[PDB]
């Protein structure tokens, strides 16, 4: 029957969520998760075993009264936004709402994972970056979310908290509003052109199921006060990766540099370290580039 | 006449501002600063050569109204709060607000001296903290405050903005919520008995007056991008104060160790090093606390 055994996520029915469920799903728990109140029910197949809970974040009370309800033994915070006040508010305080509502419930978490985000290094030029690198969050949605991380060590003491700091990851399902989608969206309708900054700045990317799979084993390892960079330790030039691309569609796009993209003092290469993780929870595959693109192509086209 | 060059001081009116004020007007400045709207106007000869702003922080839109009208060469933010949701939003998006501000001014300020806190250290094992010491903020206030630094720096490009990390300081004015100001008010009146935590934790302290002599040596040279201790580089424990105070005031009060007020985990002794201060902008006067205890119960007892 159902699974007595229950996990709770925050942003459940959002890009990463989705894949979070399944993985959780797999893992053996009883998904429960929030929503925003007021928003239309989600179509998508993979929540039709999920619970879903209508919470605002920044409402304390619905926050403590869905936890309570949804008694989980894990819990994967994936809820954030991005006004500059809203996104502090709702990255720090809507943070500490869930936190205090897990830790007064009767039975607490064996593991509560935070998605934090690995731009709280930002324009960092040691290459490679482990944990021990200097945080220099380079606008307020990355410093909303290291100060989250410093909001939520204030309940280390209630609770076994693992923070997680993912690099940049993609999939199907996320929204164009972000550079790899813009790309296979431009690409899967065989666009003629696409304007882009520089072509020769390399960053780390990942597949959000490699990504989920990797928040899967933080769960079940449980190592409460730690932090870990979330990566694939691979990192690829837009040039790279417009080159993939055209292997796949059979054409190469033409591409215009437009100044609003380009930053005049980006670090050239940028990746991280998950050495840290892999001594904690062993090796995990990490799936092609060029394999998530083409998934991304494929569902595109079918759509 | 009126100074031409001017000062803009948010917090004016409190006890860090009323002796900022008065520094400032020392060394020739105009001094302009806000106080809340709706609060009762001050009655202390101190302000009388200050132009008062009635500005909520929160209120970005009356911030760049006061900024334009101030027109200020030099900035000190003191401004600060302490509800959780309300410390953050106050020490993170006040501070912003007053930034985005200056920022968009004709001329901008030549200084922004930001005060954070030495509580963003929490409660370090290391002895004697320099700026190089690792945050580890251990309330909502001090994460605020972190939070602040970091959110600040996104305005570097468009600001000279300085950061101090004042450890513990005190003076005539501080009000008796305040450790030294229960002392001295105690001794003042001569209190028979008090009740107080553990006596054998040593922590900094510093006199208003040395910390607010910093703060303009720190305006004057406007080291931009830098960050700051400013604290006396003695650590006191509650015992050597209480001797002090005994030799001030002819007797020695009787003391009490509520359970209540002592905290078990607390650090021994925490101190500052102000090296980075005093390599940036010189000597600097340190006044010997039993010097400022002796100031304080005078002034109690003139009352």
């Given at each position: 029957?159902?699974?007595?055994?229950?996990?709770?996520?925050?942003?459940?029915?959002?890009?990463?969520?989705?894949?979070?469920?399944?993985?959780?799903?797999?893992?053996?728990?009883?998904?429960?998760?929030?929503?925003?109140?007021?928003?239309?029910?989600?179509?998508?197949?993979?929540?039709?075993?999920?619970?879903?809970?209508?919470?605002?974040?920044?409402?304390?009370?619905?926050?403590?009264?869905?936890?309570?309800?949804?008694?989980?033994?894990?819990?994967?915070?994936?809820?954030?936004?991005?006004?500059?006040?809203?996104?502090?508010?709702?990255?720090?305080?809507?943070?500490?709402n869930l936190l205090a509502a897990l830790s007064g419930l009767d039975r607490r978490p064996s593991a509560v994972l935070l998605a934090s985000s690995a731009n709280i290094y930002g324009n960092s030029t040691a290459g490679v970056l482990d944990e021990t690198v200097?945080?220099?969050?380079?606008?307020?949605?990355?410093?909303?979310?290291?100060?989250?991380?410093?909001?939520?060590?204030?309940?280390?003491?209630?609770?076994?908290?693992?923070?997680?700091?993912?690099?940049?990851?993609?999939?199907?399902?996320?929204?164009?509003?972000?550079?790899?989608?813009?790309?296979?969206?431009?690409?899967?309708?065989?666009?003629?052109?696409?304007?882009?900054?520089?072509?020769?700045?390399?960053?780390?990317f990942s597949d959000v199921r490699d990504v989920t799979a990797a928040y899967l084993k933080l769960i079940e390892a449980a190592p409460a006060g730690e932090t870990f960079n979330v990566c694939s330790e691979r990192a690829y030039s837009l040039k790279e990766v417009?080159?993939?691309?055209?292997?796949?569609?059979?054409?190469?796009?033409?591409?215009?540099?437009?100044?609003?993209?380009?930053?005049?003092?980006?670090?050239?290469?940028?990746?991280?370290?998950?050495?840290?993780?892999?001594?904690?929870?062993?090796?995990?595959?990490?799936?092609?580039?060029?394999?998530?693109?083409?998934?991304?192509?494929?569902?595109?086209?079918?759509?």
């Open positions: 029957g159902r699974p007595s055994r229950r996990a709770f996520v925050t942003g459940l029915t959002g890009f990463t969520g989705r894949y979070m469920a399944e993985r959780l799903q797999a893992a053996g728990y009883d998904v429960w998760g929030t929503v925003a109140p007021g928003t239309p029910r989600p179509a998508d197949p993979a929540f039709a075993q999920c619970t879903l809970l209508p919470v605002d974040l920044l409402d304390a009370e619905a926050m403590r009264a869905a936890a309570a309800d949804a008694r989980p033994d894990a819990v994967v915070h994936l809820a954030a936004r991005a006004e500059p006040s809203q996104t502090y508010a709702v990255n720090i305080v809507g943070t500490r200097a945080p220099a969050p380079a606008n307020d949605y990355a410093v909303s979310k290291l100060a989250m991380e410093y909001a939520a060590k204030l309940w280390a003491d209630r609770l076994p908290i693992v923070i997680a700091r993912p690099f940049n990851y993609t999939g199907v399902g996320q929204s164009d509003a972000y550079l790899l989608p813009k790309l296979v969206a431009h690409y899967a309708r065989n666009a003629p052109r696409i304007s882009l900054g520089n072509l020769d700045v390399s960053r780390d417009l080159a993939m691309l055209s292997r796949i569609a059979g054409y190469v796009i033409d591409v215009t540099i437009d100044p609003r993209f380009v930053r005049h003092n980006e670090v050239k290469s940028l990746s991280g370290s998950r050495d840290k993780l892999r001594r904690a929870v062993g090796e995990l595959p990490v799936t092609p580039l060029d394999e998530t693109l083409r998934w991304m192509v494929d569902a595109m086209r079918a759509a």
